[PDB]
Design a protein around this ligand. Structure first.
Ligand SMILES: [Ba+2]
Ligand SMILES: [Ba+2]
Ligand SMILES: [Ba+2]
Ligand SMILES: [Ba+2]
Lengths: 370, 370
């Protein structure tokens, strides 16, 4: 929908979708964030490209178009190689056709970044798998080179698939994808570069986001660096602790408009956290905590009720009372406890207060002696 | 779709859907199964009821209608009690209206069994939760009594929701559901009995199936027996080992037509396992095993290839060779190994052979000396 609500009790291993990914896009101009791109400026209203955010290299003439993720960017493949290679969703195919059309007239070299999902359609229930397509066109060669970046793992000799059995089984959407790309060009104007697939090792989504950040930055120049066999040592150095906290904190604790994100990437901008986000995040915690899992559910709830109250009384033409501050001080230990704690900690860090007490201490009307 | 394919690597904790549940319906006339109903005969073409399978109590005049599960039998509820109670999907509402209409003219007492799914619509991503509606009409009282059976757990004093906070949060679809039911009757002909909800303690789906089996059988007479506070000791005695193996084996290892199921319940019938099911199950194992996780993937694959080959060569006008049997004997250890093993064991048990060797030993053309 139009907003991207805080999902408490979300974590990296709980999977990615298009909305989440688009929400993480907000991290690109955040300086506190390990995904920050200062390799780049927003583009030149110039030539935009529908469905994609445009970028000029602070170093280069090189233009970088990064597509907003889409639920319809998807490729089904048949595992059984007797069946047809598969399908691509029509929108994806459309963006391919549109890229082709963009490059047919373009002076400056470019790189197009299309996060998508690939899935087996042969399996009783298949897993949708988050991966990354990038197409790079250069005007001198008239040449497009497709490349696809994939997380899951690499070729353990046991789970190694035989050359023979490769004849009988597809593990990827590569065949249908190559077909879609060759199809997007017939001016026969473009000589197609060679299709390649890069692999590592549902955390895959997070890796994909890191890869987007990598791909863009890596156009400073050369040397595309992903975990195995080229570049980074392990996937801990690549997707790091700060990377993971950044992502989880964005998705878990914030509340973001699509408008805020599009405005944030269509010009260079950070999106500072509003107090209203803190209120919404609390509210959501509240609504969840009343079902699932010491500190009793009823205690946690009374606490969040009170804190919400104080939090938006602050927002209005008013300022809070001595007695309300008393209650809050009674509640800070419940509020700093565990998950709810990590929540209020996120928000205090971003509102610039050391504690709740510090946060609400000003805006207290004391006028009564005692 | 029209078929219910074997889902290898499915287990009880992986959740339920309507197709799976409908497939488990096949277990009701299976004698090897702990869900077998010999409390009952198929009904009397008589009055049928669309969307539901009819039943006459071998003991009674009491009629039992058990609805085929439906993806559209669903109820959304708002957790936040400031919002409206929720919605019911129109089909569900329709079946309610239709039950009401069935009872308005009915001589014999009846019980209607409607498995469905209830979910929070307020939560960023909600869990669809499998539960069970039953409505029992009696012609003397002109009275319908709704009852809903729910798995998740019961009222741990910590996670106990306060009477006050019950004011602020709904945990169930009860409000909207009661509303739908009262709505299905205005002849104001029926005096509505009191709405109740029974709870225990995504395994919930399996519990629901057991409950269906319970509810039906429990109409032998009286005493509805579910785990806590009434009836059974624990949920191990209620949903038992044989229950769980039965369900898992049905869903994991069989391949069943909707037609086979409807024919199986519209007359009293077992659905004996065909050899073709064994072939399909193997095929599916094969297609999965080429992605995910000693015995190498390539070994497992060569084995399943060979076994499939021998398995449907058997099916035709032909019978297998000495050399093929040699190969198979080489492969039985790979085939009996682990998961693939539990598969072939299921199928041998149901085809009446002690091993693969026993199974394929007849149908071998030996004509060559040596
Ligand atoms: Ba297409
Ligand atoms: Ba070529
Ligand atoms: Ba309705
Ligand atoms: Ba009443």
């Amino acid at each position: 929908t139009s907003i991207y609500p805080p999902e408490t009790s979300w974590e990296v291993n709980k999977g990615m979708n298009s909305s989440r990914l688009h929400k993480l896009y907000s991290l690109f101009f955040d300086k506190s964030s390990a995904f920050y791109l200062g390799d780049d400026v927003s583009v030149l209203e110039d030539k935009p490209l529908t469905g994609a955010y445009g970028f000029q290299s602070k170093k280069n003439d090189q233009q970088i178009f990064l597509f907003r993720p889409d639920s319809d960017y998807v490729a089904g493949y048949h595992v059984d190689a007797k069946s047809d290679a598969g399908w691509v969703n029509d929108k994806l195919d459309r963006r391919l056709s549109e890229i082709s059309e963009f490059c047919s007239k373009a002076t400056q070299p470019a790189t197009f970044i299309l996060p998508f999902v690939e899935m087996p359609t042969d399996i009783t229930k298949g897993v949708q798998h988050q991966v990354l397509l990038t197409i790079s066109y250069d005007p001198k060669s008239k040449q497009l080179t497709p490349t696809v970046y994939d997380s899951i793992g690499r070729d353990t000799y046991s789970e190694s698939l035989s050359s023979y059995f490769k004849g009988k089984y597809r593990t990827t959407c590569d065949e249908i994808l190559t077909q879609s790309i060759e199809k997007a060009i017939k001016s026969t104007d473009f000589t197609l570069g060679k299709f390649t697939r890069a692999a590592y090792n549902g955390n895959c989504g997070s890796y994909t986001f890191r890869t987007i950040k990598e791909v863009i930055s890596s156009s400073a120049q050369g040397t595309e660096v992903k975990i195995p066999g080229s570049g980074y040592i392990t996937s801990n150095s690549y997707l790091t602790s700060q990377h993971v906290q950044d992502i989880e904190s964005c998705i878990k604790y914030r509340n973001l408009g699509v408008v805020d994100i599009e405005s944030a990437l269509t010009e260079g901008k950070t999106l500072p956290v509003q107090l209203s986000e803190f209120i919404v995040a609390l509210e959501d915690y509240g609504k969840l905590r009343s079902q699932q899992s010491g500190y009793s559910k009823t205690a946690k709830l009374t606490a969040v009720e009170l804190l919400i109250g104080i939090l938006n009384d602050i927002k209005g033409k008013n300022e809070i009372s001595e007695s309300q501050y008393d209650k809050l001080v009674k509640e800070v230990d419940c509020l700093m406890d565990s998950s709810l704690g990590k929540l209020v900690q996120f928000h205090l860090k971003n509102l610039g207060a050391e504690s709740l007490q510090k946060l609400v201490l000003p805006c207290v009307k004391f006028d009564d002696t005692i």
